[PDB]
Structure formats: structure tokens, C-alpha cells
Amino acid sequence: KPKLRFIERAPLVPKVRREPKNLSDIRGPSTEATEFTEGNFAILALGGGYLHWGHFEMMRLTINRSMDPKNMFAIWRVPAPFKPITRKSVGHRMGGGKGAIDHYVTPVKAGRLVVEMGGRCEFEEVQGFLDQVAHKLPFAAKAVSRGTLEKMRKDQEERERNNQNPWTFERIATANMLGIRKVLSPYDLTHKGKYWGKFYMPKRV
Amino acid sequence: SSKNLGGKSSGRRQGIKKMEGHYVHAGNIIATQRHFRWHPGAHVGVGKNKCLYALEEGIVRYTKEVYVPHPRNTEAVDLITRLPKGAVLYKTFVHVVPAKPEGTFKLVAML
Amino acid sequence: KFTRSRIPEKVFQASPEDHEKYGGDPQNPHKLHIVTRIKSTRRRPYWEKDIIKMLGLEKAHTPQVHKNIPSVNAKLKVVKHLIRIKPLKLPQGLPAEENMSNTCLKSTGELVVQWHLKPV
RNA sequence: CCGAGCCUGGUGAUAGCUGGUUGUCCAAGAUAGAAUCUUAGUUCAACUUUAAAUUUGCCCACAGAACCAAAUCCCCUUGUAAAUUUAACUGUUAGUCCAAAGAGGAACAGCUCUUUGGACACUAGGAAAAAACCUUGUAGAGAGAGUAAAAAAUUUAACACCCAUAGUAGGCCUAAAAGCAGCCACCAAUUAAGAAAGCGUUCAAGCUCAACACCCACUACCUAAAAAAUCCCAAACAUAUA
RNA sequence: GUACCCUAACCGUGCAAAGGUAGCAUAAUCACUUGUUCCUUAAAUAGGGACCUGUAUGAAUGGCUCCACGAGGGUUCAGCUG
RNA sequence: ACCUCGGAGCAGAACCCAACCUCCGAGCAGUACAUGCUAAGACUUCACCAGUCAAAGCGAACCUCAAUUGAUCCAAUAACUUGACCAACGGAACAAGUUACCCUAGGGAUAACAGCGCAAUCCUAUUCUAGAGUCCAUAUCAACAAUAGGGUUUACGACCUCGAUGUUGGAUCAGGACAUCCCGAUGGUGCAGCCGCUAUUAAAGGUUCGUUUGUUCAACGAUUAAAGUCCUACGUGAUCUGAGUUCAGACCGGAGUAAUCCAGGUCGGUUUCUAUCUACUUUAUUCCUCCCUGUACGAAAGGACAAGAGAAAUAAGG
RNA sequence: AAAAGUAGU
RNA sequence: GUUAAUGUAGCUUAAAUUAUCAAAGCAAGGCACUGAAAAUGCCUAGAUGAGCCUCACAGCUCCAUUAACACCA
RNA sequence: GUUAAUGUAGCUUAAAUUAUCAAAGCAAGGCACUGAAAAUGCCUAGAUGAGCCUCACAGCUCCAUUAACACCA
RNA sequence: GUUAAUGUAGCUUAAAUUAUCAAAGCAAGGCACUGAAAAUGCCUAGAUGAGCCUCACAGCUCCAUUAACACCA
Ligand SMILES: [Mg+2]
Ligand SMILES: [Mg+2]
Ligand SMILES: [Mg+2]
Ligand SMILES: [Mg+2]
Ligand SMILES: [Mg+2]
Ligand SMILES: [Mg+2]
Ligand SMILES: [Mg+2]
Ligand SMILES: [Mg+2]
Ligand SMILES: [Mg+2]
Ligand SMILES: [Mg+2]
Ligand SMILES: [Mg+2]
Ligand SMILES: [Mg+2]
Ligand SMILES: [Mg+2]
Ligand SMILES: [Mg+2]
Ligand SMILES: [Mg+2]
Ligand SMILES: [Mg+2]
Ligand SMILES: [Mg+2]
Ligand SMILES: [Mg+2]
Ligand SMILES: [Mg+2]
Ligand SMILES: [Mg+2]
Ligand SMILES: [Mg+2]
Ligand SMILES: [Mg+2]
Ligand SMILES: [Mg+2]
Ligand SMILES: [Mg+2]
Ligand SMILES: [Mg+2]
Ligand SMILES: [Mg+2]
Ligand SMILES: [Mg+2]
Ligand SMILES: [Mg+2]
Ligand SMILES: [Mg+2]
């Protein structure tokens, strides 16, 4: 069966404990699935963000409505929604605890492949509707191939060699050159100067 | 509402009271803990509440040493007989190297 | 949190291309530093406010000689952006006592030993 | 002026509450918390001041600190001059924002709450005015001098030209499905045109596209909207040398 | 819960000291609410007469009619008047 | 709802660390019976009070646990000892409602109105091509989503004001925005024509009178070219109103033993001001009728624009 | 002492 | 926190040791069936461990249940 | 939105743990037939899930149904 | 202008999935004939469509409608 499955809202063993919202699940490069597993053409996530169940339906509709199940397959790469989100009821004053578990999200970091697609097809073909779905994703995304993606990282290790701007961000943060760690995060020692909050700026080394 | 009560105990101040190389005396509490962290080694006793006191004056040293639990310590000799044969457990220990001798002999009487 | 930084010891080893940008040779390193405060100790943490009061650097743009020994360098590594370091490069000798009454610093950092203001 | 008259006395009632506190000059000086009918307050601790006695105090390097990230602790050297105890006290103990790690809330608030550090309630220059951002702090006269921080940069979407025959009303099931509702195979002529990729048809027909031929040659920059309510808001300027 | 409008004449069962009886009723009577209908109006969240879930009416905490009366509070024909 | 003690997270690696932040627990049970007596040195819940550990010695054998708790004074006891859901848990020996009849001291340290911040809810526009539209995404409508905007609502925060910033509707006078209801011009149409639907541009001009209710609203009647969306301290009370709401009186239903109370209703209920200062005080649209004519269009019912004539209405000025 | 009913010509 | 009284066939009472009866309960006993009233039979651990002898019967051990009081820090 | 109560044979009632007795419903029998009555039977996932020990059983874990409270300008 | 909640053989309820019955009305059953009662069958687009797995069975597309509301203070 070469079709994306019924990924579901609110998993079956539910989360009675209300997890604190940690925002470290969104920052920086991915540590999970950033590289392919038996596919060719995929959606890259060039920004952090959560993924609602209304976001999985837009993916499960417009891929499976416009992919031929004789010639192409598709698998998810993201997990199920597991992180619960609390919503206090409408119009309530501050304080009083934590509200009930309303819905669920899954956190996607930047540089993570979210949907994998392959088969007897080409990338100039499936750009027709992977670019359709990557604009409705709630982060900056772009459709990659196996071969188009690695073209991007060939340039990203070229921009760290080409430039004659004699200071990089890696040089100044690590050495603490202008006393700059008064204004820098510990996490921007180890990300690079590229990520900043949720957002990824690819246009800088 | 806020069904969560009782989260209002203070931190217990359990830690090392004498770091490595400190000149401890006979009876100072070297380290204080619950749920064993540093085991008592040479010339270091242990209390009821697992505090580590020194018994000999000297310098406190911290090492890594082989764990062999007491055979009537049933909670650990079961834990020993599940390892593969090449294994040992290596807890960390607190010693006191003594600094004064036990004494000298003094002439009191050309008698 | 914001806190005291260790700096890697990778950056305090000069490249072979770095010995051409400045005037030093790695064998025979210099004896004393010239340390001059060029930045304020305000809007800086309290540890940098304490280091500056030890190195004699309470006053901006007054140079100071500190030894080129690693116990001084350690204090200088944690305050190296408030200060400007040049080697004290003596052209002539160390001053003798008959000589020592008329010396000048000569920024370009050359503790010249004979300071008479007639021209060449 | 009666939810209990008025006058005098007690009475200078009491007020953790508001207001007010009068010469000149110099000096040190910013708030970890805990109890409390306590959170508009006070007592202790902390921080601060003074007078003393003594000897170390900050900064730190090897080594060292648990199993189930930034860093800190301990710490000789060294740079430095403070620290600890003793004696006497008052006051502050209703805080703001910025950076960073977090928690609550909308991954809202000039929001609330902790931590680390700043700065502010201390003067001055800058960011238009400006508490909190940046530069900078130990004081006076000067019609001297070098500097510090310090003024935003951007303007985008042309496109191939011609030509198209034919085993075919390609087999199935369909009122009918002829390349184009659906299945199956994807064979094939001339040089060259898919058992056909989009419209158009009940279906057929009609349009293109992919093809020979045609040539100079695909010519190929791969980009990214704007709305309030008294009246736009410095004036303006592309060109003489860091 | 029934004959049957899906409503109780009745059946079965519990508690009570007694289970709100007679009247009146969308009221100066929690809400729904501008209940529904006839009249009044060209038009009526007003007013008058009824129907009754008043599920929070109700009998000297007085209930309901009725003659007079009221600088009481609403509705109105007609006249009249800046 | 909580109030004291304990484990765990936030607080990742000495110690510490809030929260009406997330989760678990405790207010004891069990064995001894040396759970005897003393005594160097230390830890410490950020103070104190309390809590902790313990070498040696005298004396005899040869404690588990995480919290598992309560000061002083007084009682009872010959003495050793023993007394609190003193749980508001550092504990007042023993004391509840109510106040719109209220008073005083303060507070913008703290709420209502108004401003401001924010934009979750609201509103709008685009991106995307699902699907409606017999076919056909883009005439019109639009799913899941994305990106911007606005600052009209319900909120939320508590920053200015409690040694007073007067409060809803209405009257009067209006200023402004345009996201246009009418009038004007234009593109598309699933626009035959008439009416329309939608979009660009345009804010000079205009935008009705009544019954009911305090009503903004809304329902309705009659029209109109149309009966705009909003802001302006929910514009405007030193210009007015006082019907409601928001004091003292009073019923009614309910709550409560009562006093009293109610986003429940209903009758009634004082709206002050002589102007110092700023500011200021005389500068054209639209409808309809006739005509085109019963033409253009359509098959017909239906039916135009344009040009032209003339009538009125408002507004402004006499 | 306790007995209630029997469809329409 | 202290006294004082009391436990029974399933429920009420008592007899000075030697333990009496009405309900409940099981039967026939009788009529076309329910209830009394008679009755035989049946069920008294006389609340607890011993006894100083023979104990509802008595000096202790308590298991409890109820009276009369007195406790605040 | 918050508090407190309560989830039972098809129905309602209880029992301080073991779930009774009263309908209804099921077969019999008395009456010509049915009722009423007399002899029997059956019927509760005791609303929701693990068990520290044994739980309608007592702490919860859950969904329905009701009460009283959603105010001050 | 707002949300939540319902949409059924013809009528009603339900089954908290797998679709029950009383009727309107079909004809057997039994009586002289009919009523009543009993035996069945019928007849459920589950209000609307792509199903993601399969669907009253669940999120919606959708066409009506009951309520709560937009009041204030
Ligand atoms: Mg803790
Ligand atoms: Mg604490
Ligand atoms: Mg006084
Ligand atoms: Mg006070
Ligand atoms: Mg000073
Ligand atoms: Mg108080
Ligand atoms: Mg703040
Ligand atoms: Mg053609
Ligand atoms: Mg009423
Ligand atoms: Mg009179
Ligand atoms: Mg201490
Ligand atoms: Mg001992
Ligand atoms: Mg207290
Ligand atoms: Mg207390
Ligand atoms: Mg009154
Ligand atoms: Mg009164
Ligand atoms: Mg007052
Ligand atoms: Mg406000
Ligand atoms: Mg379509
Ligand atoms: Mg304020
Ligand atoms: Mg605040
Ligand atoms: Mg005020
Ligand atoms: Mg004033
Ligand atoms: Mg416009
Ligand atoms: Mg106003
Ligand atoms: Mg005014
Ligand atoms: Mg009057
Ligand atoms: Mg007036
Ligand atoms: Mg003035």
C-alpha cells in the first residue's frame, strides 16, 4: 500500500500529565531524521515548528489525491503528534493552574525531512505538488530530491571556504571577541550564527 | 483549582562539605547525602543518615575503587550475580590520609 | 544564563600565517607586556570589574607593564577585549640607575633609554 | 452635619495611615532570605556605616566532586590589597527594563514568576525626543588637543517558429464510450508523430503538445502586495580623491 | 410506565409532619420573554381579554372579585395648543 | 481552592531558587528493650527556635523507614512523665453574620468608566488549488492550511488618574478615515435587454419620517438615488436631557434563624460654575417628466442607453 | 369476614 | 482524661447455688388458603482466662457498651 | 465556568462488608375463562480500571444525572 | 450576527457498532361473521457526498430547526 496512512489526532494511550512547553524542540538543526531512508524526493523543513493534525490532513490529502499508487510510494518521516498542548478556557483570568490537554503537536526542527516520496518518478514531476504542500506547512519548507539536497550542502560547505570576510560568527562567539557573549546564547555557540529562534537563515555562513 | 499540593519543601543542603585535599579533622562531616553517592573509604565512617564523617585527622582524598558488597547485603549480591564475568562495578570512595603520627616516645625519667 | 566563559585553548596558538601579520618570532618571546585599557569597565560583569582593579588599569589610556607569564595571561585572557596589548620592545638595554631618570615610553612601545628633545 | 445630640473633662486619645521636618561643606552607601491575624508593618539574617584587633582575602592550576549544556565548587602559583574577628548602631527589607536559560499565558502583553549578569533610581555624550540599549564613570578653572559610542539599505515576472500522415471505430465491458470514464498491452509505416499529455465533445469530430524537417538559437536575469480615523512630515542631494 | 396526543383517568414503588387545596396566572411575581392568540395601531418590547411550566403564585407573610377615592404608576377616544 | 512536613521536575554537573507551576506522598506501622550514661569534632533547610551525625570513654552484649509532626505558659503527677485536626500547623487562653444608613484614614501600591499595551476571539486581503458552479478551481462561492494587515468586539494586563479624568442612550454641532450605501468613471460575467453579481478608481455632495421599548440595537409601517462601515475620552453634560443605571423609601419572587441580600423585576429619587489662558467667531448636487419610442435588444412578456427639452427638492447666498 | 369482570347485532 | 453500672435461646426481664416464659424459629396438628390463641418439642457458651472450693453466684484479667463528671494553653 | 451529592433486579426501595422484600416478567395449580389471591422459581458487570490487603464495599481512574453558586460598580 | 445539540420503516422510540416493534396498511391462523389477542413477511439512502479503516457509528461538505445569546455596569 503506497499511500500515507491515517496519522491520527490525540494518540490512544493519552497523556494524563501536562508536559511543560519546552521550546528547545524547535531550535536549531535536527538531530533526528535529516537523511533519506529508501526514497528520493522529499520535503525539507527549513524552519522549526509544530505540526497540528489539521496540518497532517493537508499533507495526507494533497499528496494522496495527486500521486499515482501504481508508480509512486510515500512514507512519513515525522512521528505522530505526541506533545500535548494546554488551552485554558476562553476568557479566564491569569493564575489558577494549568488548563486541560486540548490538542497535540509534533515538533519538527529545521533540516529534518518530514515526508519521503519515491518510485518510478522524477523530481521535475513531483515538484508539481510538493511545492504545493510545502507552502501550506507552518514553517519555511522546500521540496528536495536526493540529488538536489546534496547540491545545497555542497554550497554550504563552499560558503565556509569562499568568503574573504575575515571574521566568521564561529570565530567571534567562541573566542568572545567584543565581549559578545553578553549578548549571545549558549545555544548560539553550538548552533552557529545561522539559527535564531525558530528561524533558519540559510543566506549566511 | 490547582490539584497539586505539597511542592514546598526546601533543598536539604546535602553535598560535599570537604573537597579533595582539604585538611579535615577527627569528626568533621566530609559529605552529606541520601541515596548513596560517595561511599566511605579509608578512615571515613558513615552515619545513620549516610553522612560521611572523618575519624582520623588528615587530608581527604577521592578515589575510584572496586565495589564488593557484603554477602548479607541481599539487595546488592543479587545485583552482582547478574553481571558477565569480566565485569566489576567501581563505586567512588572518600579517604582520609592521616597527617599526624600516632605519637612519639618521650624521655620522662633518667631514673 | 550569562556567565564566565572558558575560551578554547585552540585560539591562543598562533598560525604560521599569523607570524607575518605581526612582528614576532615564536622562539625568543618577549619579556613584558604593555597593557592599556581602551574600553570601560562599566556595563561589564563584576569579574571584569575586579580584574581591571588588579592589573593597575583603573584609568583608561594609561599603559602598564605586566609580565608575560601565564598567571598574568590568565587574568588578561578574561579581560582581553577591554585592553590593548603590545610587547614592550626595548631597543636599547634595560635602564641602568644613572640612565633611568630620562626614559620615555614612545608609543609603538619602545622604552627608549635616552630622552633628550633635541631633533636628529 | 442624629445608625444615636451637644458642651466640657479623660485628652497632647491612638493611628503599621497621609502630609510636614528649618545652616554650610566633604566622605562611605542599593534591596539573598526566614518567621509573622503577616505580606501598607516589624524582629532576625543579608547588604551598608563607624571605631578597633589580627592575618590573609579576592584572582585562581594540576589533581578532585553518581549512579540511575553554558557553567559552577575546591584551589597553589601569580596579579594585587583586602578580608576576618571584636565593639556599637541605624536604614533598606512594596523594585524597573535589557541580554541569556526557563515556568505560566496565546511559543500575547510596557504580562506574571525564578535564576545568571548588567544598567537604572549618580553624572555626561549618543540612539530624534527617551530610566532600563550603546559609549563613559572620582568631580575645579581653559576661548587647548586626541578620541569613544555615534546618520539604514532595498525595486522585481516578454517569449520559441513552423508543422502533423496514418494498421485503428487499439481488444474488454459498456445505451455509448473511436488517444482522452475505466481495465489491460504498450506493439507499428514511411524520414517523422505517444496506442497519446492538456482542453473539447453522449460519442465522433475539431485545437494544441511531444516528431521529422527548419536554423542564428533558446536569447533563458528564477524573482516575490498593500489599509485608517486633526496635517505628509527636516530641507535636500547619485559624480574632486580616508 | 400504559390504553392513545406519547399524555395522564390508572398501575407499581420510595420519603414526608403534610405533600401547594380553593382561587388567580406570563403578574409590581428569578429567568426564558418581545410566551401564544383576539382587540387597539398604517406599524404596538406598550395597553386590554383570554389560554397556563407559577417546577420560584397562592389563601390574616392573607387569596380572589367589587362601589367609591388617589398631586400614585401605566393605556386611550376627543378637543386644544409654538 | 489553599495554609505544616517529605520525594521528584522546572533548578541537566558544589549548595541554594519562585509559582493559585507539573506529579507523587506523610499526620504511622514494625522489631527490640543498653531505644543505658557521658563526651572531642562537625553539618544545618538560608536568621533564631529547632532539627542532624558522631570518634573516644564508663557500662552491657559478643534499630528499618521519607515525611510519619507542635514552642512557651499552665494543667495532672510523689517522681519519672503525660497532655492540642493549638491542621490558620512559629501556636491570641476563650469571639460569627451584616451594612445601599454607613463613617474615618489611605490607595491609582488595587478593581469599575476612559486611555495605553497585546490581538487569543473579531475583521480584511492575498498565497494554495480540495470541492461547489450540468461541464468547467479562478462569473460567483469556497475546505484544510500559509503569509501579511487592521485595532471596531469579547477578553487579558494593571502602566497614568481614587487631595474625583462625571456614566448609557438622546438633543445640538459635527471633524476625520475609506474597508463605497447612493451619485461618477472603468474591467470581467454563468452580462440577450432590463435588473444584477463581482473587482479597480473616486470621500467634493448626500445618506428619511414614524409605532413599540431608557434603548444603541432590532421587529415593523411608509418612502427614498441611498437609507454606509467605523473612529473621534464607547466625539461632544464648565452646551442640554435624566428614561435607564449607580445611594437613602418601597413592594414582589427567592436566599438566609434574623439583620440583610440578588447582572431579577417595578414605582419614586438635588445634574453646581460670574470664563483668567489657549483655540475660534461671514469664502452646488440629485431626482423625475417629456422626447429619442414604445426605437437598441428579444421570438415575446419585458425593455434601454446617449443627445435634447423642462420641471421640482435640498443645500448655499440674498 | 372476603367475589371484580365476561364484545356487537 | 476519671469513676459507676451491664452483657444470655435473636430480642425483654430475673430467681440469693439448684438457670423460669412470651415473641422470633421449625413442624405436624385443620378447614377450599393467609393471622391470633393454645400447645409439645427446640435454641439459655449465664460476656471473658484460670480457680481459693462448686459459681448468675467471687478477688483479679480484660473484650467491649452505657451513665455521672472533668482539660486550657 | 466552579463546588457538593448519586449512579442497583426490567422498576423503585434498602442492607454500614455477606445484597433482602415489593412489583413487573416465567411456568404451574384453584375458577368455565381472566383477574385478585396461594405454592414456586429467575433477576442486580452493585455507573467507571488497576490492585497495598479481600471491596456496592475504600482511596482514587472514568462517563452520565441533579442541586447550589456564576457576584460589586 | 453568534455557538452547541438534534434530523429514521408512514408514525413513534431505541439498539450508546453488529440495525429491534407498536402502529398505518398485506394475507395465513381461529370463529357462523367480525372484533380482540397471537404467527410472519414487508417497509430503515440511518438529514446530505469523497471515504482515512469499514461506519448512527467521524472530522467535514451541506439543506432545516430548538435552545442558549449579542444584556450590561
Ligand atoms: Mg523541591
Ligand atoms: Mg521553597
Ligand atoms: Mg498623634
Ligand atoms: Mg501595615
Ligand atoms: Mg561618594
Ligand atoms: Mg494583614
Ligand atoms: Mg514586567
Ligand atoms: Mg487541427
Ligand atoms: Mg417573570
Ligand atoms: Mg390623600
Ligand atoms: Mg545555618
Ligand atoms: Mg561508641
Ligand atoms: Mg499562624
Ligand atoms: Mg504560620
Ligand atoms: Mg433600601
Ligand atoms: Mg432600611
Ligand atoms: Mg473616605
Ligand atoms: Mg480597562
Ligand atoms: Mg468542479
Ligand atoms: Mg497602576
Ligand atoms: Mg506588576
Ligand atoms: Mg480614579
Ligand atoms: Mg488636583
Ligand atoms: Mg478606494
Ligand atoms: Mg462619551
Ligand atoms: Mg466638556
Ligand atoms: Mg412624584
Ligand atoms: Mg449646567
Ligand atoms: Mg493655559
Q: Cα(A173)–Cα(A190) distance, rounded to whole angstroms?
A: 10
Q: Which residues contact residue A190 at a Cβ distance below 8 angstroms, ignoring those fewer than 6 apart? A: none
Number of domains making up chain C: 1
Q: Cα(C52)–Cα(C34) distance, rounded to whole angstroms?
A: 14
Would the CA dihedral through B2, B4, B6, B12 be positive or negative?
negative
Q: Cα(C36)–Cα(C108) distance, rounded to whole angstroms?
A: 13
How many angstroms separate the alpha carbon of residue A99 from the centre of ligand 20? 28
Task: Give the three-class secondary structure for A118.
Answer: strand
- Nearest-nucleotide field for A9 (CA, C1'): J59
Q: Which domains does chain B have, with CATH numbers?
A: 5-111 (2.40.50.100)
> For chain C, first and last CA: distance in Å?
59
Q: Cα(C19)–Cα(B95) distance, rounded to whole angstroms?
A: 50
Per-residue flag: C116 CB under 7 A of strand D: no
Quick one: cell of A24?
A: 528547545
Cα–Cα nearest to A12, from A81, A113, A66? A81
- Nearest-nucleotide field for A16 (CA, C1'): F23
Q: Cα(A80)–Cα(A51) distance, rounded to whole angstroms?
A: 10
Number of A to C CB contacts under 8 A, please give it.
19
Quick one: cell of A65?
A: 489525491
Question: CA-to-C1' distance for A110 and D186, Å?
Answer: 45
Cα–Cα nearest to B40, from B15, B14, B23, B60? B60
- The C-alpha torsion from A132 through A136 and A141 to A142, rounded to 10°, is 0
Would the CA dihedral through C54, C57, C59, C64 be positive or negative?
positive
Task: Give the three-class secondary structure for C33.
Answer: strand
A/C Cβ contact: 3+ pairs below 8 Å: yes
**Chain A partners within 8 Å of B3 (Cβ):** 97
- Nearest-nucleotide field for A50 (CA, C1'): D107
| Resolution of the solved structure (Å) | 3.7
| Inter-residue contact A125 to A34 (CB < 8 Å) | no
The residue with cell 518530514 is: A114
Cα–Cα nearest to B64, from B96, B95, B37, B91? B91
Q: Cα(B30)–Cα(B97) distance, rounded to whole angstroms?
A: 13
Determination technique for this entry: cryo-EM
User: Could A175 and C45 be called an inter-chain contact, meaning their C-beta atoms sit closer than 8 Å?
Assistant: no
**Measured CA distances, C12 to A53, A137, C82 (Å):** 52, 46, 17
Q: Cα(A1)–Cα(B3) distance, rounded to whole angstroms?
A: 47
Burial class of residue B59 (count of CB atoms within 10 Å of its CB; 0-12, 13-18, 19+): middle
Q: Cα(A141)–Cα(A105) distance, rounded to whole angstroms?
A: 18
* Residue at the smallest CA–C1' distance to nucleotide F5: B9
Quick one: cell of B109?
A: 625519667
Task: Give the three-class secondary structure for C31.
Answer: coil
| Inter-residue contact B38 to B61 (CB < 8 Å) | no
Domain residues for C29?
A: 1-117
Query: In chain C, what is the greatest distance between 2 CA atoms, to the nearest angstrom?
Result: 59
DSSP C97: T
* DSSP-assigned beta bridge partners for residue A200: A195
Quick one: cell of C61?
A: 589610556
The one-letter amino acid code at A35 reads: E
**Chain C partners within 8 Å of A177 (Cβ):** 81
Q: Cα(B58)–Cα(B78) distance, rounded to whole angstroms?
A: 36
A interface mutation test: which of C5, C11, C12, C83 has the most A CBs within 10 A?
Answer: C5
Q: Cα(B52)–Cα(B69) distance, rounded to whole angstroms?
A: 18
**DSSP per residue, A12-76:** SS---S-----GGGTSSB-SS--S-SS-SEEEEE-B-EEE-HHHHHHHHHHTTTSS-TTTEEEEE
Angle between helices A53-62 and A123-133 in degrees, nearest 10:
150
Strands (E), chain C: 32-37, 64-67, 83-87
Question: Which of the 64-103 residues on chain C come under 7 Å of nucleic strand D at their beta carbon?
Answer: 66-67, 69-72, 74-75, 78
Q: Cα(B94)–Cα(B59) distance, rounded to whole angstroms?
A: 10
Q: How far is CA A50 from the centre of its chain?
A: 8
Q: In A77-108, which positions are buried (b, 16+ CB within 10 angstroms) versus exposed (e)?
A: bbeebeebbeeeeeeeeeeeeeeebeebbbbb
Burial class of residue A16 (count of CB atoms within 10 Å of its CB; 0-12, 13-18, 19+): exposed
User: Could B3 and A97 be called an inter-chain contact, meaning their C-beta atoms sit closer than 8 Å?
Assistant: yes
CA atoms within a 13 Å half-sphere pointing along the CA-CB vector of A80: 13
What secondary structure, in 3-state letters, does A120-151 show? Answer: CCCHHHHHHHHHHHCCCCCCCEEEECHHHHHH
Task: Give the three-class secondary structure for C84.
Answer: strand
Task: Give the three-class secondary structure for A161.
Answer: helix
Selecting from A174, A178, A182 the residue whose C-beta is nearest the C-beta of C2 gives A182
CA atoms within a 13 Å half-sphere pointing along the CA-CB vector of A55: 22
Query: What residues of chain C, 4 to 63, have a C-beta less than 8 Å from chain A?
Result: 5, 7-8, 11, 44-45
DSSP B92: E
